Write a protein that binds this ligand. Sequence first.
Ligand SMILES: Nc1nc2c(ncn2[C@@H]2O[C@H](CO)[C@@H](OP(=O)(O)O)[C@H]2O)c(=O)[nH]1
Ligand SMILES: OC[C@H]1O[C@@H](O)[C@H](O)[C@@H](O)[C@@H]1O
Length: 94
Amino acid sequence: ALADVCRTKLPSQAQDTLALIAKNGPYPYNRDGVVFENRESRLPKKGNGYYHEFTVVTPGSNDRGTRRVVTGGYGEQYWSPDHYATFQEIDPRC
Ligand SMILES: Nc1nc2c(ncn2[C@@H]2O[C@H](CO)[C@@H](OP(=O)(O)O)[C@H]2O)c(=O)[nH]1
Ligand SMILES: OC[C@H]1O[C@@H](O)[C@H](O)[C@@H](O)[C@@H]1O
């Protein structure tokens, strides 16, 4: 049961991250692209290595912070402002 968000409504940092995803980087962190395990199953329960996580920069700071995009195996994209506590499916069509 998944909240949905239009790509245009995403903070501009989140959109930068999707742009880096679409050209496969370079990414600003070695941790970008690591397997997201979906341990809590807030996202569709899928096989090993389906999901990958990518940093969204906090505005102001250049630390990683708590903002993230998880991608799925067919290019589904998920937004998390709250360090994997909740997810919204990104609709790239709006
Ligand atoms: N909550 C949660 N975090 C995960 C899961 N799988 C990987 N992570 C997080 O993804 C990141 C890379 O392994 C780590 O957090 P981080 O964003 O602080 O680096 C790790 O804690 C998961 O299934 N659930
Ligand atoms: O040790 C490797 C790590 O260095 C950190 O400073 C960065 O966030 C990443 O590039 C990586 O996850």
